[PDB]
Design a protein around this ligand. Structure first.
Ligand SMILES: OC[C@H]1O[C@@H](O[C@H]2[C@H](O)[C@@H](O)[C@@H](O)O[C@@H]2CO)[C@H](O)[C@@H](O)[C@@H]1O
Ligand SMILES: OC[C@H]1O[C@@H](O)[C@H](O)[C@@H](O)[C@@H]1O
Length: 358
C-alpha cells in the first residue's frame, strides 16, 4: 500500500544479535566460514523484548538509533518483538515466560507495555516496527481446546489489545503475529483467522499503525516453494505466499487493507522436517532470503528476519520445566539449550547452509 513502514528509513542493526554473532564468529574455526558468520551482524533482524529486563535495552537502541540518524543524516528504524504475555506459549512448554495469569500477570503485562511506551515516547524521530506476540492469536484460532489456551483467552485478548492500543499512541507500526501456512493457512482456518484478526483490529480502533500481520515467525516455511514440501499434504497453501494470497482478501472484505511481513531467517534449507508441526531447532536449517521490501507480492511489505537464527527454540533436556517433546524429535538438533539462549552449533549450521550463500 501507500505507506510501507520501511520506505525512506535505514534499519538500525540489532546490537543484541550483533554481540551474539561477533562472539559466535570467533569460535567458528574455518576462516572463510567465520567471516561469512560475522557478516550476519550486518543483516537486519528483530530484537525480542521477551522479558521486562529487555526494556532498558530498547531505550539504548532508540537513543543510539536517534543519534545515528542525526550523524548520518538518515531516519532510523528499530525492529522489535513484543513477547511477554502472561501464560505465554499456551500450547507448548518451551517458551513459557516470566508472567503468569495466577501471579498478577495481566497487570504486570500492562506495566511492561507502559514501560515500553515510555521509552518510545522519548524518541519520536526513530521509527519502530513491532511484531505483536508470536503464537498468541494463532493459538486462539485453532487451539481453544487446549485448556491453558482456553483459560488464557481473555487475558491474551486484553493484553494484545492493550499493546496495540497503547503502542499506537506513540506511532509504532505493528504486525500482529499470524502463525504460518501450516497453522492458519489451511483453507478451513483462513476465515476463523480473518474473523479473529479483524475483531482484534476493530477492538484497537482500526488504527492506521496496525499495518497487518507477520507470518512464519520462528518457522521454516518457504515464501515461494519450488515444489510443495511433502509435509504440506492436504493444504493447497503449501508456502507463505499461498497463505497470504488466500488470507489477505478476507481481511480486505472486512474493511482492513492489511499488509504482511514474512520471516525467512531460517528458511534457507527446505525438506528438513518429518512433519509440518516439527517447529523446534530443526536440524540442518540455513539462513534464508535476506530482508527486503522487494517481496514480489502486493500484500507483503517486507521479507524480514524475526526469529534470530542461533537462539534456541527450546531445551531438549527432559528435566527442565520447559521441556517440550517437539524438541526431541528425530529432526530437532540435540542437545539443545533453553529457548532464547545461544545455540552455537545451530548458528554455525545456519551460516554454512545459508541460501543464498553469505
Ligand atoms: O511456528 C512456531 C510455533 O509453532 C507452534 O505449533 C504449531 C505449529 O507451528 C504448526 O505447524 C502446527 O503444528 O500447529 C502448532 C500449534 O499447535 C508452537 O505451539 C509454538 O510454540 C511455536 O513457536
Ligand atoms: O529467539 C527469539 C525468542 O525465541 C523464543 O523461542 C524464546 O522463548 C525467546 O526467549 C526469544 O526471545
Amino acid at each position: 500500500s501507500a505507506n510501507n513502514p520501511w520506505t525512506g528509513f535505514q534499519i538500525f542493526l540489532s546490537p543484541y544479535y550483533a554481540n551474539e554473532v561477533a562472539a559466535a564468529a570467533k569460535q567458528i574455526t574455518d576462516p572463510t566460514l567465520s567471516s561469512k558468520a560475522a557478516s550476519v551482524a550486518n543483516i537486519p533482524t528483530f530484537t525480542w523484548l521477551d522479558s521486562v529486563a529487555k526494556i532498558p535495552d530498547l531505550g539504548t537502541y532508540l537513543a543510539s538509533a536517534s543519534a545515528l540518524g542525526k550523524s548520518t543524516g538518515t531516519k532510523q528504524l528499530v525492529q522489535i518483538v513484543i513477547y511477554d504475555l502472561p501464560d505465554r506459549d499456551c500450547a507448548a512448554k518451551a517458551s513459557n515466560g516470566e508472567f503468569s495469569i495466577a501471579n498478577n500477570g495481566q497487570a504486570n503485562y500492562e506495566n511492561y507495555i507502559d514501560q515500553i511506551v515510555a521509552q518510545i515516547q522519548q524518541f519520536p524521530d526513530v521509527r519502530v516496527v513491532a511484531v505483536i506476540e508470536p503464537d498468541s492469536l494463532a493459538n486462539l484460532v485453532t487451539n481453544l481446546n487446549v485448556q491453558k489456551c482456553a483459560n488464557a483467552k481473555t487475558t491474551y485478548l486484553a493484553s494484545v489489545n492493550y499493546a496495540l492500543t497503547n503502542l499506537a499512541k506513540v506511532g509504532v507500526y505493528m504486525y500482529m503475529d499470524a502463525g504460518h501456512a501450516g497453522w492458519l493457512g489451511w483453507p478451513a482456518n483462513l476465515s476463523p483467522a480473518a474473523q479473529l484478526f479483524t475483531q482484534v483490529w476493530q477492538n484497537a480502533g482500526k488504527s492506521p499503525f496496525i499495518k497487518g500481520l507477520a507470518t512464519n515467525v520462528a518457522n521454516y516455511n518457504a515464501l515461494q516453494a519450488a515444489s510443495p514440501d511433502p509435509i504440506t499434504q492436504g493444504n493447497p497453501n503449501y508456502d507463505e505466499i499461498h497463505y497470504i494470497n488466500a488470507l489477505a482478501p478476507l481481511l480486505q472484505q472486512a474493511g482492513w487493507d492489511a499488509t504482511f511481513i514474512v520471516d525467512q531467517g531460517r528458511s534457507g534449507v527446505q525438506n528438513i522436517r518429518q512433519q509440518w508441526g516439527d517447529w523446534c531447532n530443526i536440524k540442518g536449517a540455513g539462513f534464508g532470503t535476506r530482508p527486503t521490501t522487494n517481496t514480489g507480492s502486493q500484500f507483503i511489505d517486507s521479507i524480514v528476519w524475526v526469529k534470530p537464527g542461533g537462539e534456541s527454540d527450546g531445551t531438549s533436556n527432559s528435566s527442565s520445566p520447559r521441556y517440550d517433546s517437539t524438541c526431541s524429535l528425530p529432526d530437532a538438533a540435540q542437545p539443545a539449550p533453553e529457548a532464547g539462549t545461544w545455540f552455537q552449533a545451530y548458528f554455525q549450521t545456519l551460516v554454512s547452509a545459508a541460501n543464498p550463500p553469505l
